Amino acid sequence: TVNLGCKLDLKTIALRARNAEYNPKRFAAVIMRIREPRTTALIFSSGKMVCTGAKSEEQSRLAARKYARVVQKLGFPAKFLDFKIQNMVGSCDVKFPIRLEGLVLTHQQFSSYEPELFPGLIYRMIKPRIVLLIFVSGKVVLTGAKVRAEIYEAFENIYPILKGFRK
DNA sequence: CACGTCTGCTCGGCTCGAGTGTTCGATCGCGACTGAGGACGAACGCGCCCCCACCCCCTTTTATAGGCGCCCTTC
Q: What fold does the segment set A86-167 form as a domain?
């Protein structure tokens, strides 16, 4: 997220902008999307904006600055204030099938495998407090992170266990 | 002025109305044994409306995947 520091007129924005859309009857924020690092932003009337989609923190800082740029170019007193990363998402694969019934058995306290509902196992780490999604093919997705190290650490913890249930 | 007669006032007798109290239909309240031989559950219960306080839901991005609805195509 980032705060622009001033109030704006989203309808004018919607009118001016070329890569945006606005619908008060649907949602309050105006939606913008740029090809740079290919991203999307949520701009509030309050002066707050949210930026998602970047594949690195520098490019997200880059994209947000680019958004602040087009807002300036509209004639508005944009300010790059209070920039902060709120979440990071990662994934990887291990290339082998795995034992999930066992994993949920041996980690009952954390796991919440629901094969009926969502196909993969939901694992809630409490180290760098991270949420993982593990699938039978071996693919793994991670979220809840604030820095890359938490992903490597959370994965560094889970990888031996997973190899240990290899089929 | 004196005596007799007519008219008006007072004492007494009578009528009427209010007051006090009896009779009688009507309503209401209370009581009615012994013991067999057990047999196990049934559920809620002015409601609605206003105020208000707090927490949920809508959107977007992405890899990941079993599930599934729509529709095009073929039999």
A: TATA-Binding Protein (3.30.310)
* A29 C-beta neighbours (distance < 10 Å), count: 18
Tell me how far the alpha carbon of residue A133 is from its chain's centroid: 14
- Spell out which residues of A between 22 and 81 contact strand B, using CB within 7 Å: 26-27, 31, 33, 38-40, 42, 52-53
Partners of A91 in beta bridges: A141
| Residue A86 CA to its chain's centroid (Å) | 8
Cβ contact A74:A12 at 8 Å: yes
Method used experimentally: cryo-EM
- Domain A1-85: which topology? TATA-Binding Protein (3.30.310)
